[PDB]
């Protein structure tokens, strides 16, 4: 369980905030953890401590035992679950279906496909003319900006992907070990 | 109760997302035999 | 199946040990997920060194060195020609020097100028595509056929040995 | 609510505003259900 | 999604018997032979001659029996009938071209087989 | 350089042959034909692999030969595959007896 | 707590915020629903 | 692909056509608004040759008209993606090559044209040619192209092609 303790030192570092992390530090020792002791030791607000505990309960990071005295032990499957969710976002938002360079008319900010301006394509000018106004078309640009969001995300998602892939290899080294 | 539903065997109050994910897994034959046509 | 991991769309080799890698003209790496993710975004643009892929040249094999893939494919395309056996030469030193010339041509097509190599290929390929290259294509086809026949003869003999000892026991 | 759980709120304002959303969306469709204190805008006008 | 490279036709194309540029060309004058008789009729459409002026400038074969045989040529072959019409209006001359023209016939027969039909085509096609 | 390529080819083919997840018995000419068809290694350069690795390993002044115990083994294995037939037997085992939950594919010439 | 009490502690300087961590957390839709691990393994297969 | 398929249609007759020669009046009215007006779901209606049967004319309540269902066999052209075809060039531009197959329009993007055939705006007819000028593809030239994608709008069909593939060019 020492490895899980170590993975825990990383995740608290990697994710939880000081208020959470200070409480999570106490969770380090899985020998005995009462509610009165943890309250007095942390000197956190009782309502607020109950909120954090309730939050940790939501993680299933703590298994309450009715000794009434209580005990709190690890039940969080979110680290691997969250890494899988990261892989799922990496795979859907980041991908761009096509170049999608539809003509767009700068005067009326109307959006066209390469197909839309093809019917418009004006053979006397060797270029593409907008529909109701003969002003020349432009790149898709702001219109239909799936790529504009994806291009920024594409790169943001790849950085997050190297960091999370390192975290996932550490998790597999722990998860494979315990079979 | 009012706009919420409780459940004791530990008296939880059910979430719409939870019961929604529960429903998301019923196959198309038991849902059919309980009446709800899946199409 | 446990290599460092796919470059572009890094998921395949780390999770699934059920893949194979395809090399390009410049010869680095591409998996099937790379193949499809690359074809939808250019179809013939190398992930790193941007080599100008002629007709989307890609070749799927199962090795984990790119120079190995390069040497295997080029070695096959060279040894389709240059088929003079030891039967075809008068002496032994000429045959061993001929195999060393084949190694020279493979290493020249690895990194050197491909012009003098192709002129040497023109001369030898013409002068021996007259007679010897097609003849040895025929002979290598005959030996492939007879090796497959001999392996099927071995397996018929093993099945007969199994079934005859079973019929010994039951009889 | 989008911005309030966009930043990780205290997970307690979220209960009393999820009940607000549940009430407001159960207010548009049917109001004459017993209990559920009625909503009003004008001069004591219950919602239609 | 609808690609003839992956051979996805709508299920309505089961009784979709096909033809090539010459059989189109044949009846196109018969419709003009319909405009000869049956008077007191208005002018023709635009697409009628637009296709007729196109597919009459280029033909794939010459006359009736040239095709009446080539359909009997592919008659005994183990073919999808979609296959015959694709190369009937291709006129290829090398077998790997035809398999570069078709993403689907690499693994059916010997290469020279369709080349022999390609030879059978270039033997019957009277070039000028 | 070419002999390192030669051992590279032989190593990758024996490694791919060992990947088979069922027990396979062969005679050594069947293994030589599988070699000489699918990774282009003929018979006489596969006989002389022991002489070549001993001369090479004498050449490059390298000191602690215990570090080079596997490759010599492989090279010596090559010699046997290219020498004897009809009396010997190449049997491939993907798994043995005492080897639960552990990949241990071995190769008895 | 702003006025009730405050605590001095050591959490270390090696803390990594990462990219869109809050946004990733707000997307744990399954929550307590079981069989998500079975789903996670199926997506990696 | 030129197909010879069977489909059906219905005609609304105005009550001033009843009486003798009622039936043939359905025929003339059939030819006009069925052929020479191509649609999007079935392809291109070129010409009809046979009309199988005319159903029973149902008098709809009010509004006078009587509807007779009809069944006919009409040759139809419907091109598919991935199809290889011979085309004629109608206009040459720097962004690409415009070709046309029958009534259908077709665009070839320049990136989908081999680099050997560079664009030449300098020639009075804009064209595509090899540097050696072995071939000079221009307007009204006959070429073979591969359909990369197809379109069907209201009555007009379009496709998009590539010359990069093997065995393409003048025919
Ligand atoms: Zn405009
Ligand atoms: Zn990949």
Summary of the model, kept short:
Chain C is built from 6 helices and 2 strands; from the N terminus they run H-E-H-E-H-H-H-H. Chain C has 171 residues and is mainly α. With 128 residues, chain E is mainly α.
Detailed description of the structure:
The structure is cut from a larger assembly and holds eight protein chains of seven kinds. Chain C has 171 residues and is mostly helical. Chain C has helices at 12-15, 32-39, 66-79, 92-111, 114-129, 132-170, and strands spanning 21-23, 59-61. Helices cover 59% and strands 4% of the residues of chain C. Chain F is mainly alpha-helical and 109 residues long. In chain F, helix 4 runs antiparallel to helix 5 (69-81). The longest helix of chain F is centred in the N-terminal third of the chain and has 16 residues, at 2-17. Chain G has helices at residues 21-25, 36-44. At the E-H interface, strand 1, helix 1, helix 2, helix 4 and helix 5 of E face strand 1, strand 2 and strand 5 of H. Strand 1 of chain E pairs antiparallel with strand 1 (2-13) of chain H. Bound molecules: zinc ion (ZN) (2 copies).
Secondary-structure topology with pairs:
This is part of a larger assembly, with 8 protein chains of 7 kinds.
Chain B: E1 6-8, E2 11-13, H1 16-23, H2 30-33
Antiparallel strand pairs in B: 1-2
Chain C: H1 12-15, E1 21-23, H2 32-39, E2 59-61, H3 66-79, H4 92-111, H5 114-129, H6 132-170
Antiparallel strand pairs in C: 1-2
Helix pairs in contact in C: 3-4
Chain E: E1 17-18, H1 21-36, H2 47-57, H3 64-73, H4 81-88, H5 95-101, H6 111-124
Helix pairs in contact in E: 1-2
The complex binds zinc ion (2 copies).
Quickly list its features.
part of a larger assembly; 8 chains; E: 128 residues; mainly alpha; Growth Hormone, Chain: A; 52% helix; F: 109 residues; three-stranded antiparallel β-sheet; 3 strands; binds zinc ion; transcription
Strand and helix order of chain C: HEHEHHHH
* Radius of gyration of chain E from CA coordinates: 17 Å
| Integer tally of domains of chain E | 1
Total beta strands of chain C: 2
- Name the CATH architecture of chain E: Up-down Bundle
> Count the strands of chain E?
1
Give me the CATH superfamily of chain E.
Answer: RNA Polymerase II, Rpb4 subunit
**Chain pair with largest interface:** E-H, 41 and 35 residues
Q: What is the tally of helical segments of chain C?
A: 6
The percent range for strand residues of chain C is: under 5%
PDB class: transcription
Keywords: tfiid, preinitiation complex, core promoter, transcription initiation, transcription
Entry title: p53-bound TFIID-based holo PIC on HDM2 promoter
Chain A: General transcription factor IIE subunit 1
């Amino acid at each position: 369980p020492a490895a899980l303790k170590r993975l825990a030192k990383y995740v608290i570092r990697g994710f939880y905030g000081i208020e959470h992390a200070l409480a999570l530090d106490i969770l380090i020792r899985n020998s005995c953890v009462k509610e009165e002791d943890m309250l007095e030791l942390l000197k956190f607000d009782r309502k607020q401590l109950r909120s954090v505990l309730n939050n940790l309960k939501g993680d299933k990071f703590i298994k309450c035992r009715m000794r009434y005295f209580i005990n709190y032990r690890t039940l969080v499957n979110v680290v691997k679950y969250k890494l899988d969710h990261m892989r799922r976002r990496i795979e859907t938002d980041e991908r761009d279906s096509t170049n999608r360079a539809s003509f767009k008319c700068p005067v009326c900010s109307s959006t066209f496909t390469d197909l839309e301006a093809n019917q418009l394509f004006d053979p006397m000018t060797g270029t593409f003319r907008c529909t109701f106004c003969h002003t020349e078309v432009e790149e898709d640009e702001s219109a239909m900006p799936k790529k504009d969001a994806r291009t920024l995300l594409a790169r943001f998602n790849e950085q997050i992907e190297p960091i999370y892939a390192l975290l996932r290899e550490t998790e597999d080294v722990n998860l494979a070990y315990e079979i | 109760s009012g706009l919420e539903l409780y459940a004791e065997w530990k008296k939880i109050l059910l979430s719409p997302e939870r019961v929604h994910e529960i429903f998301k897994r019923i196959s198309d034959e038991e849902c059919f035999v309980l009446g709800m046509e899946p199409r | 199946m446990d290599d460092q991991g796919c470059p572009r769309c890094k998921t395949t080799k780390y999770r699934n040990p059920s893949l194979k890698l395809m090399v390009n003209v410049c010869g680095h790496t591409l998996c099937e997920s790379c193949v499809d993710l690359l074809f939808v975004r250019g179809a013939g643009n190398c992930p790193e060194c941007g080599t100008p892929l002629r007709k989307s040249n890609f070749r799927v094999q199962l090795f984990e060195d790119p120079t190995v893939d390069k040497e295997v494919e080029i070695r096959k395309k060279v040894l389709k020609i240059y088929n003079k056996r030891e039967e075809d030469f008068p002496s032994l030193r000429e045959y061993n020097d001929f195999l060393e010339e084949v190694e020279e041509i493979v290493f020249n097509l690895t990194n050197n100028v491909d012009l003098d190599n192709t002129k040497k290929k023109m001369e030898i390929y013409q002068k021996e595509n007259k007679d010897v290259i097609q003849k040895n294509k025929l002979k290598l086809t005959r030996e492939q056929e007879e090796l497959e026949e001999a392996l099927e003869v071995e397996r018929q003999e093993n099945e007969q040995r199994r079934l005859f000892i079973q019929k010994e026991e039951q009889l | 609510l989008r911005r309030n759980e966009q930043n990780g709120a205290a997970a307690h304002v979220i209960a009393e505003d999820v009940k607000l959303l549940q009430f407001h969306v159960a207010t548009m469709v049917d109001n004459e259900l017993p209990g559920l204190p009625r909503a009003m805008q004008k001069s004591g006008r219950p919602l239609k | 999604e609808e690609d003839a490279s992956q051979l996805i036709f709508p299920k309505e194309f089961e009784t979709a018997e096909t033809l090539l540029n010459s059989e189109v060309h044949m009846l196109l004058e018969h419709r003009k032979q319909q405009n000869e008789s049956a008077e007191d009729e208005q002018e023709l459409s635009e697409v009628f001659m637009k296709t007729l002026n196109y597919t009459a400038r280029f033909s794939r074969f010459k006359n009736r029996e040239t095709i009446a045989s080539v359909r009997s040529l592919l008659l005994q072959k183990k073919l999808h009938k979609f296959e015959l019409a694709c190369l009937a209006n291709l006129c290829p001359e090398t077998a790997e071209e035809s398999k570069a023209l078709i993403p689907s016939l690499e693994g059916r027969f010997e290469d020279e087989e369709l080349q022999q039909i390609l030879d059978d085509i270039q033997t019957k096609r009277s070039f000028q | 350089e070419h002999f390192l390529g030669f051992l590279r080819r032989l190593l990758e083919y024996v490694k791919w042959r060992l990947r088979v997840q069922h027990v396979v018995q062969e005679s050594p000419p069947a293994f030589l034909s599988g070699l000489a068809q699918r990774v282009c290694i003929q018979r006489k350069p596969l006989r002389f692999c022991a002489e070549r690795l001993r001369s090479l390993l004498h050449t490059l002044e390298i000191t602690d030969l215990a570090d080079f115990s596997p490759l010599t083994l492989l090279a010596n294995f090559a010699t046997l595959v290219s020498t004897y037939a009809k009396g010997f037997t190449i049997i491939i085992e993907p798994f043995d007896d005492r080897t639960p939950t552990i990949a241990n594919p071995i190769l008895h010439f | 707590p702003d006025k009730k009490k405050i605590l001095f502690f050591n959490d270390k300087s090696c803390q990594f915020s990462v990219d869109e961590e809050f946004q990733k957390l707000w997307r744990s839709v399954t929550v307590d629903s079981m069989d998500e691990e079975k789903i996670e393994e199926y997506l990696k297969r | 692909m030129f197909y010879h398929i069977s489909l059906e249609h219905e005609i609304l007759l105005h009550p001033r056509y009843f009486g003798p020669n009622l039936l043939n009046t359905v025929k003339q009215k059939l030819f006009t608004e069925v052929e020479g007006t191509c649609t999007g779901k079935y392809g291109f209606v070129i010409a009809v040759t046979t009309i199988d049967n005319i159903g029973a004319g149902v008098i709809q309540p009010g509004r006078g008209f009587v509807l007779y269902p009809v069944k006919y066999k009409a040759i139809v052209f419907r091109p598919f993606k991935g199809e290889v075809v011979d085309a004629v060039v109608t206009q040459v531009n720097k962004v690409g090559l415009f070709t046309e197959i029958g009534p259908m329009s077709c665009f070839i993007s320049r990136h989908s044209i081999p680099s050997e055939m560079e664009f030449d705006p300098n020639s009075n007819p804009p064209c595509y040619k090899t540097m050696d000028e072995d071939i000079v593809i221009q307007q009204d030239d006959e070429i073979r192209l591969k359909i990369v994608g197809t379109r069907v709008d209201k009555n007009d069909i379009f496709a998009i092609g590539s010359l990069m593939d093997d065995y393409l060019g003048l025919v």
